[PDB]
Amino acid sequence: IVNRYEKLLSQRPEWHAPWKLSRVINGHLGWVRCVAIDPVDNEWFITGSNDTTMKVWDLATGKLKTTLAGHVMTVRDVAVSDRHPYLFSVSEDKTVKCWDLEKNQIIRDYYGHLSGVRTVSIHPTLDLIATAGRDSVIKLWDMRTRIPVITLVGHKGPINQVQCTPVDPQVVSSSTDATVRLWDVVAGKTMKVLTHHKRSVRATALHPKEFSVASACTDDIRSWGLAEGSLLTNFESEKTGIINTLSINQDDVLFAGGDNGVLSFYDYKSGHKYQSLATREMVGSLEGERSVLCSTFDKTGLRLITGEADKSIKIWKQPGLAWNPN
Amino acid sequence: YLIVEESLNNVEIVRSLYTKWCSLEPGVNAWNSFVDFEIRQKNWNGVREIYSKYVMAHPQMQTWLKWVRFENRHGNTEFTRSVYSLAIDTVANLQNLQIWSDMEVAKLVNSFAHWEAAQQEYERSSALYQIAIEKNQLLKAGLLDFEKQFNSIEETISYKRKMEYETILSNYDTWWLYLDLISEFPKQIMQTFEKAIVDSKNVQWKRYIYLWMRYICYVELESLLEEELFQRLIDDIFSKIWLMYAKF
């Protein structure tokens, strides 16, 4: 309609600074298909991989702190907790393990997932984590009693990212069924099922200050306030690659990594793509490989960290692009 | 669902369904289907409304054309005209670039002009083209076409101007200048000629000489200017030119 387009044209987005590559830390001998940082501090960030390991990394130096070898198969995801000094990690060996960070050694392997487990999210407020695998089910664990407390049946296929919010919409799943769910853990049921994607929403992330949750199928990055479970915006992601990552920055600077490796940045809520970045790879590696598989920002937000399939981790420092809608 | 309804031959329900479908900003195809259905039904009251709705939902100039075509098929000439006006008005109204390509608007304008021509009164077409010009190349072309169809002198002049512009862009030059002069307005033509001269190895020299000669001729037709030209030539530095100057 003309009534909306005109309005869109009238409104302007804020000039977010562009992004330039800063650090590249070829250290893993495998994909680096998870990355995470400490809520409390931003000194280190760990990165689980197809190595089977996960390595810890000092941001400032870029130096490899230490390794951790508590899986058999490849690590798919990790989550350092704000409220406790535990690092949860999870691998396609079906193990959702829990590393003490006072001793850097596993403690509570949680057992229950029938098959390769894709993501963890620690609940920001509770002493409870949430994991989901190709199982097609998101189980919540009491961390003390290392048992699945509840489980969330709804989904009809493998479930990827499964973020935890502190409100009522306490889990924000995202499947290959292309539904992204909002659940009520307490009710033992769904509350609202965002079906707006076309394909496997293989990426989703909570906004820090804004109580919303960007989510990405093969192209269209939707983003939504999950209070009602209502759409907020659609991003200009029109011919970008298969969106692997979908991290959001503190300053409303949503990042999206592709299977292409084209690092695409967007103003959040606007839905305005305001940068593209061509990937890079090593002289030995192939041009098809290069692809940002996992990524996240620091708590401040000036450094984006992208794990790419070059067996690398690339950290990114910081005139905006013209609007032009449909 | 629609086909089932058709088979049944209960039509109100089908209509309702169609309406519902069309409220969900569906495909152009759906809209077209709906239109077809409406046509098939006896009434042509409501079809217009639906078309309007479609247009509103799909700001696309092809839609407008389609609507017009329906109008044409229908008996009323006034209605078609009104529709055209509305289309034009809508295009005008969004001055901001929230728009279908400038080719599509041009096309629409052309169509309107054609319609007008087919109708009794031609002034209207001319007016429309003037309006178009005021609010580019495509538009100009359309205007020219309209003129041809039909004022003729004016059209010719416009064409000449366009040609001159093209030549300038490319940059024959002398010829262009001459044409401009002819078109003139006279003052403007003269200015253009002067500019050309200013703009203006052996071949180049020859061209320059020719230009100078032309200028001299112009002056004659119209002494100080000639003197100035001579001075300029001298500075640049021919014998023939000097001789001519002396004679003058």
């Binding site: 909306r4 707006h196 804004e210 109580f211 209070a227 659609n234 606007s270 | 409220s23 900003e25």
Partner: peptide, 24 residues
């Protein structure tokens, strides 16, 4: 009518696209 009730237009519409200062 029932069908219409079942699926509404505002679902397809993003809410932020109209109002930017609006924040959840």
């Amino acid at each position: 009518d029932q069908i219409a009730k079942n699926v509404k237009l505002d679902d397809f519409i993003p809410k932020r696209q109209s109002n930017f200062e609006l924040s959840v």
